[PDB]
Design a protein around this ligand. Structure first.
Ligand SMILES: *[C@@H]1O[C@H](CO[C@@H]2O[C@@H](C)[C@@H](O)[C@@H](O)[C@@H]2O)[C@@H](O[C@@H]2O[C@H](CO)[C@@H](O)[C@H](O)[C@H]2NC(C)=O)[C@H](O)[C@H]1NC(C)=O
Lengths: 239, 214
């Protein structure tokens, strides 16, 4: 059993968006399906449920009339149509399967109409999720500043240097070093969302202290959402 | 309206803990359909209990569940570091809807310590020319994944302009985090030093930068 979400993206409030969920590894036509969402650093929020044959639909009060669930059993696909999007709709969206099977009575297994599953009232399969971001912020490439190595950043034989990737929108940015030739001692930190609505993050690399001034170090920042790429050379300080 | 859970609970390895989940006559108290879900960082939730007390196939028997009136309860015996994460309860409703609990952060205590590596970068000259200034404090290779970050201007505490990330697991299964202090060039030049203080398990590692230094 497998669930794969898609259709997520970054939009301004009032915009529309259509989420899709590809299901495999089981009889999609017989099982109920849920949409569940989780905002960044927040709790799970049940969004909607749809019966195996789509004859019944249920939506949360907070999304009713704006988000709507649907399904196509001929293509084994679950849909979530998102209209009049609001900032609070910003979250990771999960396609989730309703656990189910036959009900048991008088020594008999009963199924619903057309042998559809009865709900067992718990979720047994989750997709990895698709990201939805609703923001008034406009697209913006990152400003890349050097985080130069000095005596106050070295640890004996090794030294730390990096790049500050500042004020971009939206996520994500990816960072490599020396065009991927430098993969050891490298660590890129998760981004912070500043009150400006713009993001910032840092990428750091640990290198031989003796190699400074002889070896060149360039951070390759990539921001596809703005079609921007920046190669930043990091010069060593004399401190 | 979501079901009420405690914000956080914690115990030591081997001992037993219990997480409560409070609903109404139209959800928790109305049906025998309460389920519990475990969520690790950057992961989808996994069910550990359903129908109040039933265990899914392949779930540890350390997990148990019960219910009394409007209060559902998840109990974890023989605590392990593996059990660390967020726990959510879920219930069917009288309106045929589903509702999750507010979730509980479960922390496993008494684990073996790893002190944090702290690297503090002052504002680059380039950023300064752009009439801006950012202090970058990077924290890595610590465990457990709980830290506290405080900033100092000279000797005085600073909270304004501070942005800090929640700790996340590294590839090496340790934790890392970062903190940023946004200043004006004037503010930066106005003080003799700025300090990034990282507290971790009753110990504080502090790094300092000064405008007077390169
Ligand atoms: C979730 O509910 C439990 C149980 O609360 C009892 O039942 C409620 C419906 C209401 O009638 C309460 O007055 C009852 O106490 C709460 O458990 C209590 O927790 C406090 C401290 O947290 C403890 O001192 C009490 O002994 C507990 N009471 C019982 C009966 O065990 C729990 O606090 C609730 N969770 C919250 C409020 O977040």
């Amino acid at each position: 059993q497998r669930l794969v979400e898609s259709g997520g993206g970054v939009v301004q409030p009032g915009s529309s968006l259509r989420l899709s969920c590809a299901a495999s590894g089981f009889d999609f036509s017989r099982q109920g399906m849920h949409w569940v969402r989780q905002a960044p650093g927040q709790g799970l929020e049940w969004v909607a449920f749809i019966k195996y044959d789509g004859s019944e639909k249920y939506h949360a009060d907070s999304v009713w009339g704006r988000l709507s669930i649907s399904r196509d059993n001929s293509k084994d696909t679950l849909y979530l149509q998102m209209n009049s999007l609001r900032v609070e709709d910003t979250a990771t969206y999960f396609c989730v399967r309703e656990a189910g099977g036959p009900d048991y009575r008088n020594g008999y297994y009963y199924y619903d109409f057309y042998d559809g599953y009865y709900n067992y009232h718990y979720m047994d399969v989750w997709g990895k999720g698709t990201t939805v971001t609703v923001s008034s912020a406009s697209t913006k490439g990152p400003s890349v500043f050097p985080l130069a190595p000095s005596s106050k950043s070295t640890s004996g034989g090794t030294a730390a240097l990096g790049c500050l990737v500042k004020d971009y929108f939206p996520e994500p940015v990816t960072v490599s070093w020396n065009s991927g030739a430098l993969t050891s001692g490298v660590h890129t930190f998760p981004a912070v969302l500043q009150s400006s609505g713009l993001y910032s993050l840092s990428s750091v690399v640990t290198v031989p202290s003796s190699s400074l001034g002889t070896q060149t170090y360039i951070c390759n920042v990539n921001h596809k959402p703005s079609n921007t790429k920046v190669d930043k050379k990091v010069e060593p300080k004399s401190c | 309206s979501a079901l009420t859970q405690p914000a956080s609970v914690s115990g030591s390895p081997g001992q037993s803990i219990t997480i409560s989940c409070n609903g109404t006559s139209n959800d928790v108290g109305g049906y025998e359909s309460v389920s519990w879900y475990q969520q690790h960082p950057g992961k989808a939730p996994k069910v550990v209990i359903y129908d109040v007390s039933k265990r899914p196939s392949g779930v540890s028997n350390r997990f148990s569940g019960s219910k009394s009136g409007n209060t559902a309860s998840l109990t974890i015996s023989g605590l392990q570091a593996e059990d660390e994460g967020d726990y959510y309860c879920k219930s069917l409703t009288s309106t045929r809807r589903r509702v999750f609990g507010t979730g509980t952060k479960l922390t496993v205590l008494g684990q073996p310590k790893a002190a944090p590596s702290v690297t503090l970068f002052p504002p680059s000259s380039e950023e300064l020319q752009a009439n801006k200034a950012t202090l970058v404090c990077l924290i890595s290779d610590f465990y457990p994944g709980a830290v506290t970050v405080a900033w100092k201007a000279d000797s005085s505490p600073v909270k304004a302009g501070v942005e800090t990330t929640t700790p996340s697991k590294q590839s090496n299964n340790k934790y890392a985090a970062s903190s940023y202090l946004s200043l004006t060039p004037e503010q930066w030049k106005s003080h003799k030093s700025y300090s990034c203080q990282v507290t971790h398990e009753g110990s504080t590692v502090e790094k300092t930068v000064a405008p007077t230094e390169c």
